[PDB]
Design a binder for this molecule. Structure first.
Ligand SMILES: CC(C)(N)[C@H](NC(=O)c1ccc(C#CC#Cc2ccc(N)cc2)cc1)C(=O)NO
Ligand SMILES: [Zn+2]
Ligand SMILES: [Zn+2]
Length: 296
């Protein structure tokens, strides 16, 4: 059978919060079967735990935030994307502050942490959510969709008209039958436009931002000295974001996500909308891995 997975060992890293600019200690720890991913604010007294579930998401305008009462964990999506991509079902995530460190702006550093810790198979069937009916949400011209698909696929389109994006592909369709999350998605960095970053900084936000952890673009150019890591890095980062935001479902997906100019807010709305309609999905397990449309 396809088994649940956790970490073999505890592993640590340090970094700064993109939004807060605050140095933070990050710890990833093994967890028992059926735990899911649970964040813990170990700086607080008492320590506060927040399960990484769609219903615990708070504000989403900037990054995906988990909340419990007055306690938050900001910017969970890049770490969760790595968890999702490597098939980690169960883990504790300990933080010394209210924001996951931004690291290099991608999921690469978290893939390295997970691969370094090692993967541990557990004696329980891994549960998948299979999309049975297409479900969609929209806001203005933005749209996010789950579509039935025998496998796991993420498609995305962005539609920037600024000169810097002219001629760029702005679309990608990743079928993970034949695409490596690690090699072809995980290192795509977050990005921002100068005018937007200036606005944030003017308000004493984005205090951890630097050209070392974000792609900076203006109307016409990519400003980073060495340009892009992937030819289509922008849309690949939107896919990275979607994979992490989607993992708040708490299980891997059998289906296709399609995003059109969408972000964290529609991603979470899509999850809550899916969860609420039991005719649109079912939980499946695979007693024979060979019969599965996916592979970890
Ligand atoms: C792409 C998204 C989905 N919109 C989203 N990214 C952000 O919202 C975002 C917000 C701020 C920054 C930034 C910076 C910077 C700087 C800087 C300031 C001063 C100096 N002297 C040098 C550099 C990057 C990304 C995201 O990935 N969510 O997961
Ligand atoms: Zn423009
Ligand atoms: Zn992102």
């Amino acid at each position: 059978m396809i088994k649940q997975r956790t970490l073999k060992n505890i592993i640590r890293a340090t970094g700064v919060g993109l939004h807060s600019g605050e140095k933070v200690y990050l710890t990833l720890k093994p967890a028992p079967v059926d735990t899911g991913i649970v964040f813990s604010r170990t700086d607080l007294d008492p320590v506060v735990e927040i399960p990484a579930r769609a219903e615990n998401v708070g504000e989403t305008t900037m990054s995906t935030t988990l909340v419990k009462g007055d306690v938050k964990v900001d910017t969970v999506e890049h770490l969760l994307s790595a968890m999702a991509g490597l098939g980690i079902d169960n883990a504790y995530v300990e933080l010394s502050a209210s924001e996951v460190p931004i690291m290099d702006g991608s999921a690469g550093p978290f893939v390295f942490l997970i691969q370094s810790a090692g993967l541990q198979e557990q004696e329980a069937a891994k549960k998948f959510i299979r999309i049975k009916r297409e479900v969609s949400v929209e806001e203005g011209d933005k749209r996010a969709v789950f579509v039935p698909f025998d496998g796991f696929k993420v498609s995305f389109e962005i539609d920037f008209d600024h000169p810097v994006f002219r001629g760029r592909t702005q679309q990608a369709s990743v079928d993970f039958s034949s695409t490596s999350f690690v090699k072809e998605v995980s290192r795509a960095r977050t990005f921002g436009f100068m005018r937007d970053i200036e606005y944030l900084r003017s308000q004493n936000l984005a205090l951890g931002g630097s050209v070392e952890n974000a792609i900076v673009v203006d109307e016409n150019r990519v400003l980073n000295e060495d340009g892009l890591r992937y030819e289509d890095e922008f849309v690949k980062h939107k896919i990275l974001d979607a994979i992490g935001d989607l993992y708040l479902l708490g299980n891997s997906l059998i289906g296709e996500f399609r995003g059109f100019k969408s972000g964290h807010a529609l991603n979470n709305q899509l999850l809550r909308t899916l969860i609420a309609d039991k005719d649109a999905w079912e939980v499946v397990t695979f007693e024979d891995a060979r019969t599965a449309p996916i592979s970890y």
